[PDB]
Design a protein around this motif. Structure first.
Motif, mmCIF file in Angstrom:
data_model
loop_
_atom_site.group_PDB
_atom_site.id
_atom_site.type_symbol
_atom_site.label_atom_id
_atom_site.label_comp_id
_atom_site.label_asym_id
_atom_site.label_seq_id
_atom_site.Cartn_x
_atom_site.Cartn_y
_atom_site.Cartn_z
ATOM 1 N N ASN A 188 -4.997 -0.633 15.624
ATOM 2 C CA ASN A 188 -6.342 -0.795 15.094
ATOM 3 C C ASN A 188 -6.669 -2.243 14.752
ATOM 4 O O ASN A 188 -7.849 -2.576 14.619
ATOM 5 C CB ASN A 188 -6.537 0.105 13.873
ATOM 6 C CG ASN A 188 -7.098 1.458 14.245
ATOM 7 O OD1 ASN A 188 -8.013 1.546 15.061
ATOM 8 N ND2 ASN A 188 -6.554 2.521 13.656
ATOM 9 N N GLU A 216 -3.938 3.995 1.306
ATOM 10 C CA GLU A 216 -4.317 4.476 2.626
ATOM 11 C C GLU A 216 -4.298 5.992 2.568
ATOM 12 O O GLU A 216 -3.378 6.580 1.990
ATOM 13 C CB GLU A 216 -3.334 3.959 3.678
ATOM 14 C CG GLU A 216 -3.532 4.520 5.080
ATOM 15 C CD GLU A 216 -2.443 4.049 6.032
ATOM 16 O OE1 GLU A 216 -1.524 3.322 5.597
ATOM 17 O OE2 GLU A 216 -2.480 4.437 7.220
ATOM 18 N N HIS A 233 0.810 -1.209 0.000
ATOM 19 C CA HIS A 233 0.000 0.000 0.000
ATOM 20 C C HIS A 233 0.847 1.264 0.000
ATOM 21 O O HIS A 233 2.003 1.290 0.445
ATOM 22 C CB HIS A 233 -1.050 0.035 1.151
ATOM 23 C CG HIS A 233 -0.518 0.281 2.537
ATOM 24 N ND1 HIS A 233 -0.139 -0.747 3.380
ATOM 25 C CD2 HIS A 233 -0.420 1.419 3.269
ATOM 26 C CE1 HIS A 233 0.210 -0.245 4.554
ATOM 27 N NE2 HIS A 233 0.053 1.068 4.514
ATOM 28 N N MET A 268 -12.811 0.311 2.246
ATOM 29 C CA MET A 268 -13.108 -0.810 3.126
ATOM 30 C C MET A 268 -14.369 -0.513 3.938
ATOM 31 O O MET A 268 -14.644 0.644 4.265
ATOM 32 C CB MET A 268 -11.939 -1.063 4.073
ATOM 33 C CG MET A 268 -10.728 -1.688 3.429
ATOM 34 S SD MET A 268 -11.128 -3.110 2.407
ATOM 35 C CE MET A 268 -11.446 -4.355 3.662
ATOM 36 N N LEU A 298 -10.205 -2.892 16.133
ATOM 37 C CA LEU A 298 -11.241 -3.322 15.202
ATOM 38 C C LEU A 298 -11.838 -4.655 15.636
ATOM 39 O O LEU A 298 -13.061 -4.784 15.756
ATOM 40 C CB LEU A 298 -10.681 -3.410 13.780
ATOM 41 C CG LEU A 298 -10.673 -2.076 13.034
ATOM 42 C CD1 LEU A 298 -10.012 -2.225 11.671
ATOM 43 C CD2 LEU A 298 -12.091 -1.538 12.890
HETATM 44 C C1 LIG Z 1 -7.228 -3.837 10.231
HETATM 45 S S1 LIG Z 1 -6.445 -2.205 9.943
HETATM 46 O O1 LIG Z 1 -6.183 -1.805 11.518
HETATM 47 O O2 LIG Z 1 -7.463 -1.726 8.746
HETATM 48 C C2 LIG Z 1 -4.821 -1.620 9.351
HETATM 49 C C3 LIG Z 1 -4.026 -0.769 10.137
HETATM 50 C C4 LIG Z 1 -2.777 -0.333 9.666
HETATM 51 C C5 LIG Z 1 -2.339 -0.788 8.417
HETATM 52 C C6 LIG Z 1 -1.021 -0.393 7.728
HETATM 53 O O3 LIG Z 1 -1.112 0.923 7.281
HETATM 54 C C7 LIG Z 1 0.250 -0.740 8.536
HETATM 55 C C8 LIG Z 1 1.506 0.140 8.278
HETATM 56 O O4 LIG Z 1 1.476 1.062 7.224
HETATM 57 C C9 LIG Z 1 2.819 -0.653 8.288
HETATM 58 C C10 LIG Z 1 2.793 -1.619 9.482
HETATM 59 C C11 LIG Z 1 1.709 -2.694 9.317
HETATM 60 C C12 LIG Z 1 0.543 -2.240 8.420
HETATM 61 O O5 LIG Z 1 -0.597 -2.971 8.776
HETATM 62 C C13 LIG Z 1 -3.138 -1.629 7.661
HETATM 63 CL CL1 LIG Z 1 -2.522 -2.161 6.080
HETATM 64 C C14 LIG Z 1 -4.367 -2.067 8.106
HETATM 65 O O6 LIG Z 1 -5.143 -2.931 7.296
HETATM 66 C C15 LIG Z 1 -5.883 -2.239 6.291
HETATM 67 C C16 LIG Z 1 -6.294 -3.156 5.106
HETATM 68 C C17 LIG Z 1 -6.721 -4.543 5.411
HETATM 69 O O7 LIG Z 1 -8.178 -4.839 4.788
HETATM 70 C C18 LIG Z 1 -8.496 -5.909 5.279
HETATM 71 C C19 LIG Z 1 -7.701 -6.007 6.614
HETATM 72 O O8 LIG Z 1 -6.871 -4.782 6.638
#
Ligand SMILES: CS(=O)(=O)c1ccc([C@@H](O)C2[C@H](O)CCC[C@H]2O)c(Cl)c1OCCC1OCCO1
Ligand SMILES: CS(=O)(=O)c1ccc([C@@H](O)C2[C@H](O)CCC[C@H]2O)c(Cl)c1OCCC1OCCO1
Ligand SMILES: [Co+2]
Ligand SMILES: [Co+2]
Lengths: 386, 386
Positions: free
Chosen positions: A368, A346, A260, A287, A372
């Motif tokens: 999160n 993001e 991402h 999402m 979540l």
């Molecule tokens: C469940 S989350 O708390 O939505 C969430 C929180 C933070 C990050 C990221 O930006 C983080 C960061 O940049 C680097 C460290 C780890 C990485 O995880 C995500 Cl990728 C994330 O998942 C989103 C998409 C996904 O769609 C279905 C489940 O998740």
């Protein structure tokens, strides 16, 4: 701790290049969906017989979309006589990349003091070379080393406007869209094995590990000296009940690649209002939003940073919130950008860590994952009990 | 004259299929640019591990966008066990098509009485088979023969909603866009040699030559019995000063292919207002408008069909007008749909030939080659003289 061990002078993220089948359609979709303006082009109309490349900008964020023409148009050229504006471009590499991975990021470009020196130092410290330093019009130097998978880390340095050979776009074709996005905050890779990936990249950059604060992943973040270039990397964790989303990525992407791009907004409320209005008319989907329990729990977690009204605006827009010991982060994620369940975007905005705002203020939202899961459990229990 | 010599029962144009690198981005761009709604899908979410296919509709116009997934997702399948919803799809064919030609039309689909019989009769009369008749869910039959280049003529017949295996799109993702487009009027191919192309297609369809009324082209039009399926074909004419645009097409496309799709609007004024508002925010660009002299000359040519105000509205929107002995045509052309100067779109509306409106009413605008040249000459002379 920040040992400030960069092996060369790194400035900021410069641009992200997507390798496309058709650059025109991807660039036009992204322009409307993200509110980025068409700002530069290099294509048949500028004398480039090799590739079509279109540049979108929003603030300091630069997205480049590139696709190859028929090789027959340039069959008489050699590298010394090329009409390509990006000398690292190759028809076969681009077609093979896109066939293997689908639409996605080929290059994560950072601006450095001296791309030739950055390239030399990187390779001397283990980087796998991808494209040697090439000086364009005695003005800009570009070089590339392998980052992970078929993604390259591209170095660009300027003697003193994107790249020579690109033309600014006539303002009739340049509609001044802007939904508030201003810069690339971080760029995240998925790899099969985190340890070797970290050792490799930190080995040749001198980037240090950025201090962090079921999931299906392990992750760590590499950072430049001032922590403005941030490169998280994830690996899958095998052994849980719900299959690792990182593993699903690697299967659909045919291996490691960029997971991402996190785009900083100067007004995440305005950005999400604008992007959500366009989701079903050519833009990007988001999402599914967290349940009302997540926003009920926000009051106890960030009630000192965000007012009730600001929390309710987060709820209206589906925005997630996480907090560090130093800062607070507002974030939200798109659905995948293209056909495959691979790359997504993001949108992020950070509050706190004022000195300028320090890089990575508030972390990356790791809290999160728990919040979540917790909030979903509470919501289902509320629904069943009522 | 109409000898009504169709060798099988042909109904109407059914759909046009684009072969894409990324179907999602092309489909979203086209939806916003043309005002077409997302109406059906076949992809990972519907159990298709082979290809992503998205259907846009506006009235009776159906545009299908298809791209391949990684072959590894379906590596254990065979044709008898396929999860593809379009049985003629092949990963290698699609990648090779797109590598060779870029974004463009793979299939021109017509609805027939019986696709198996249409296929058999066509091949018995010289058609080169491309995909044999396959019956889907005992409900729809699909078959394909070569048309020109790597474009196929696809036959579809229904026992009695797009194709089995496609799911209707949940209305949240289906925004009800509509700029007035209602059906495919004609689909035009560019070929190196018109004569053999005509002999081949007319040979296996029984389609007759539709009656017609420096340029760089020769063209002729094949038509079904009721002249509702219209297939013009162009060849380049070598020997003039300004290079044949058909030859330029063949060079950039790597050979013969679909040149333009003409989309009938029920209100060409509204369609062009809506499309032009979106040209620079993700939609389609239009060819530069004719000079004011062209619209001054319109009064003498069509002043009996169009009022002064209607002529001035044509001028506001850049619309061209041509006239037959039987009808009048309003038309305008987009710039190329993608990176290469190959396929483009025409928006058209026809007035006259009321019986229903007969097919091809007013012709195809061949008179505008002369009228445009004339009007430019007059305009430059006016400017120089003033
Ligand atoms: C469940 S989350 O708390 O939505 C969430 C929180 C933070 C990050 C990221 O930006 C983080 C960061 O940049 C680097 C460290 C780890 C990485 O995880 C995500 Cl990728 C994330 O998942 C989103 C998409 C996904 O769609 C279905 C489940 O998740
Ligand atoms: C100069 S033109 O009078 O704009 C004009 C009029 C009619 C048609 C077509 O629909 C015709 C029809 O369908 C089949 C028969 C022949 C074909 O030509 C076109 Cl393709 C056309 O060129 C537009 C694009 C191009 O852009 C630069 C020059 O032209
Ligand atoms: Co992130
Ligand atoms: Co036409």
């Amino acid at each position: 701790k920040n040992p400030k061990s960069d092996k060369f002078k790194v400035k900021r993220f410069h641009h992200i290049e997507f390798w496309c089948g058709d650059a025109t359609n991807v660039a036009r979709r992204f322009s409307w969906g993200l509110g980025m303006r068409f700002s530069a082009k290099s294509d048949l109309s500028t004398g480039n017989m090799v590739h079509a490349s279109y540049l979108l900008t929003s603030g300091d964020l630069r997205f480049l979309f590139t696709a190859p023409y028929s090789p027959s148009l340039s069959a008489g050229e050699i590298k010394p006589t090329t009409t390509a504006s990006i000398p690292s471009f190759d028809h076969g590499s681009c077609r093979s990349f896109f066939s293997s991975h689908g639409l996605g990021v080929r290059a994560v470009a950072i601006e450095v003091e001296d791309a030739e020196s950055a390239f030399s130092i990187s390779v001397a410290n283990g980087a796998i070379p991808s494209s040697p330093p090439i000086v364009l019009n005695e003005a800009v130097t570009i070089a590339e080393v392998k980052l992970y998978g078929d993604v390259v880390l591209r170095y660009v340095s300027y003697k003193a406007e994107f790249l020579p050979g690109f033309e600014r776009v006539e303002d009739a074709s340049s509609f001044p869209l802007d939904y508030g996005i201003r810069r690339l905050d971080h760029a995240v890779g998925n790899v099969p094995e985190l340890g070797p990936a970290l050792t490799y990249v930190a080995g040749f950059t001198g980037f240090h590990q950025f201090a962090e604060f079921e999931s299906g992943l392990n992750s760590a973040v590499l950072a430049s000296n001032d922590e403005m270039v941030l490169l998280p990397i994830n690996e899958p964790v095998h052994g849980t009940k719900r299959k690792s989303q990182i593993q699903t990525y690697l299967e659909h992407n045919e291996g490691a690649g960029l997971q991402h791009l996190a785009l900083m907004s100067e007004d995440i409320f305005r950005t999400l209002r604008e992007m959500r209005k366009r989701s079903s008319i050519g833009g990007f989907d988001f999402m599914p939003s967290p349940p009302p329990t997540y926003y009920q729990n926000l009051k106890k977690r960030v009630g000192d940073v965000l007012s009730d009204d600001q929390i309710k605006e987060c709820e209206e827009l589906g925005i997630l919130v996480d907090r560090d010991d130093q800062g607070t982060l507002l974030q939200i994620f798109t659905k995948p950008l293209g056909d495959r369940p691979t790359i997504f975007i993001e949108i992020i905005q950070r509050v706190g860590c004022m000195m300028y705002q320090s890089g990575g203020c508030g972390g990356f939202g790791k809290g999160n994952f728990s919040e979540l899961f917790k909030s979903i459990e509470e919501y289902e229990k509320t629904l069943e009990a009522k």
